[PDB]
Amino acid sequence: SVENHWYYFYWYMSP
Amino acid sequence: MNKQIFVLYFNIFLIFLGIGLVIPVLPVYLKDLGLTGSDLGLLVAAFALSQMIISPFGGTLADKLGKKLIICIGLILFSVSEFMFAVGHNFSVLMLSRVIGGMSAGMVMPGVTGLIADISPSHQKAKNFGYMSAIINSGFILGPGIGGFMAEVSHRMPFYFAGALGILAFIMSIVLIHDPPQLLTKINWKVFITPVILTLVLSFGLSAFQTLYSLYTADKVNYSPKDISIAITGGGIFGALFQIYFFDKFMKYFSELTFIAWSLLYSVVVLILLVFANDYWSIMLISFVVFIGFDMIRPAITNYFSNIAGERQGFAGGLNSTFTSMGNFIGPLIAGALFDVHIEAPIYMAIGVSLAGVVIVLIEKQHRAKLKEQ
């Protein structure tokens, strides 16, 4: 389960 | 080097090329139309402001409405902006072109960063950030160089070349690129303040010097665009070479804070020496070493951010990028207006901000020593 969502000003990696 | 990685890094190198293409053209733009330095600074200031404003919305669109589509739209918008700037007539059309180019840049960067994160594995995060910072800037330095170097035979053909490069990058990305909440509650927010201030000061100083060198050497030594271009590109090359050749040696001897303080003091001393410069070769050689301090500060701040963040390298990278963009937006706006106030006033502003950085870093060192000895 690898998928990156875009929060404000930065990319966070899904748990 | 992978082809997709090459294309993604080109999409950033060209964006920062367009970012920096305007600085060497500032003197002829002042002469032929007739304005103050405030508008010349406000050009780059509004470009960076539009980029910073669009970056969150651009990232949201890339995450939701697809990543490749946003990158392609931003590339075509950047090419359109360059073409429009190449055919501008007054200050308003150039302002609009700068704003739309900044919006395109701010909609491209989040997509390319997402592509970098999603393509490379999880064990290449710090390296990806390091290369990212290295290209983002080896472009913000080479922009003015190439622009002024090639702006000697035509008045606006550099922007034509930028638009052609944008079209080529769009075509190459279309052919090659294929992609078939509580995260802020637990942040301490009381420890990132010093690195945030340091990177903001570094970005502000870099942008302020980029505008001020051009404006001051046009006002005093009546520099040609080619001379400014050659000086800027030579200083950038010298700084990059000296950094890549001595950064490990200086890092292995002393800590980050003392190194930053001594580098800031060196920057102040070169600025003071540049104050009294009055000859072509003298100021050219002085400028040849000004960028050394900033190009040594930037990797130190990057390493400090990486150490202080810990596991959350992405948050540190986002904060660093956002504050660098904010500094690039706040630098030229103050620099041009205060140059219009007084010719040598931006130099005093730069030495003052460097003094602020050195005092904040020395008080942070004092605090660290206090709780270390306690």
Residue numbers in the entry:
A (entry chain C): 126 to 140
B (entry chain A): 1 to 180, 193 to 386
Direct quotes from the study:
Here, we uncover the proton-coupling mechanism of the Staphylococcus aureus efflux pump NorA by elucidating structures in various protonation states of two essential acidic residues using cryo-EM. NorA contains two essential membrane embedded acidic residues at positions Glu222 and Asp307 which are conserved across S. aureus strains and required for conferring fluoroquinolone resistance to the human pathogen methicillin-resistant S. aureus (MRSA). Hence, the two acidic residues serve as a “belt and suspenders” protection mechanism to prevent simultaneous binding of protons and drug that enforce NorA coupling stoichiometry and confer antibiotic resistance.
To determine whether protonation at Glu222 and/or Asp307 were responsible for triggering the conformational change to the inward-occluded state, we constructed the E222Q and D307N single mutants of NorA (NorAE222Q and NorAD307N). Remarkably, binding assays revealed each mutant bound FabDA1 at pH 5.0 and 7.5 with Kd values in the low micromolar range and neither bound to the outward-open-specific Fab36 at either pH value. Next, cryo-EM samples of NorAE222Q and NorAD307N in complex with FabDA1 were purified at pH 7.5, which we anticipated would induce deprotonation at Asp307 or Glu222, respectively. Following data collection and processing, we obtained cryo-EM maps at 3.35 Å resolution for NorAE222Q and 3.51 Å resolution for NorAD307N. A similar trend was identified in the NorAE222Q structure, albeit to a lesser extent than in the NorAD307N structure. The nearest distances of Gln222 (mutant) to the backbone carbonyl of Phe140 and Asp307 to the side chain of Asn137 were ~1 Å longer than in the NorA structure.
